[PDB]
């Protein structure tokens, strides 16, 4: 059962005519809540169901002040307005930790999904990282990894040849390993076709994120102790 630690909670703040209203929120869930068509409930976003004047100092808002500003004193009705119209306040440590966390996740997600369209091959994480530096990418502490991946990809595509692309790999493995390979495959992609062979081996066509071509081969080879054949489809 999930909860934001009080250490990890951030503040969402809304000011009206010089008066602050603040709530303590899970930063990941708060970011999701801000997205279009999110299924995250406000109850899951809030660390406590209380509206503060100052959330770090613990001074809380009057019901009268909330009614004046929001036309409601219900924290579950006030909070969505603060989240959608307000700002996010981070401590120095939180900003540093969040940027670092998201930076690594962005590098990995790009490395996983991307290929070099010139040769069809993956870019190692280190290459993506180097491109981000060249493009002087600033990672945001708060924006979701999903949103930032697209921003960052656009920024680095002038530095390196890069595109998100799924690829299809045909694999051939001994029949004894087919059950086991299904489990490995499910970490990497989706089986689009599979056929037991006349000779007892098993062939599967697997659609994977293009940046995983080498990792996929490595895991399959380790599983089958080298008893695997792979090729890119066509």
From Swiss-Prot:
Position of the signal peptide: none
Source species, domain of life: Archaea
Entry-linked PROSITE patterns: UPF0023 (PS01267)
InterPro entries for the chain: EFG_III/V, Ribosome_mat_SBDS_CS, Ribosome_mat_SBDS_N_sf, Sdo1/SBDS, Sdo1/SBDS-like, SDO1/SBDS_C, SDO1/SBDS_central, Sdo1/SBDS_central_sf
A Pfam family this chain is assigned to: SBDS_C
GO biological process annotation, one example: cytosolic ribosome assembly
PANTHER family with a match to the protein in the record: RIBOSOME MATURATION PROTEIN SBDS, RIBOSOME MATURATION PROTEIN SDO1 HOMOLOG
NCBIfam families, sorted: RNA_SBDS (TIGR00291)
Protein family per UniProt: Belongs to the SDO1/SBDS family.
Name of the protein this chain belongs to: Ribosome maturation protein SDO1 homolog
Originating organism: Methanothermobacter thermautotrophicus (strain ATCC 29096 / DSM 1053 / JCM 10044 / NBRC 100330 / Delta H)
Record lineage: Archaea, Methanobacteriati, Methanobacteriota, Methanomada group, Methanobacteria
């Amino acid at each position: 059962s999930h909860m934001v630690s009080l250490e990890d909670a951030v503040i969402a703040r809304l000011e009206s005519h010089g008066e602050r209203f603040e709530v303590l929120v899970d930063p990941d869930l708060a970011a999701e809540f801000r997205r279009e068509d999110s299924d995250v409930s406000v109850e899951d976003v809030l660390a406590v169901q209380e509206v503060f004047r100052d959330a770090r100092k613990g001074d809380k808002a009057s019901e009268e002040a909330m009614r004046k500003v929001f036309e409601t004193a219900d924290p579950l009705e006030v909070t969505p307005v603060i989240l959608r119209r307000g700002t996010i306040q981070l401590t120095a440590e939180q900003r540093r930790q969040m940027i670092e966390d998201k930076r690594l996740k962005i590098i990995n997600k790009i490395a996983r999904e991307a290929i070099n369209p010139q040769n069809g091959l993956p870019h190692p994480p280190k290459r993506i990282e180097k491109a981000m530096e060249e493009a002087r990418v600033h990672v945001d502490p708060f924006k979701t990894v999903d949103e930032q991946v697209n921003i960052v990809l656009k920024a680095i595509r002038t530095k390196i040849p890069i595109k998100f692309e799924k690829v299809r790999v045909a694999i051939k493995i001994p029949g004894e390993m087919a059950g086991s390979a299904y489990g490995v495959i499910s970490n990497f992609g989706k089986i689009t076709n599979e056929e037991w062979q006349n000779d007892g081996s098993w062939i599967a066509v697997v659609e994977i994120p293009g940046g995983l071509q080498d990792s996929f081969y490595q895991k399959l080879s380790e599983l089958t102790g080298g008893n695997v054949e792979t090729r890119l489809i066509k």
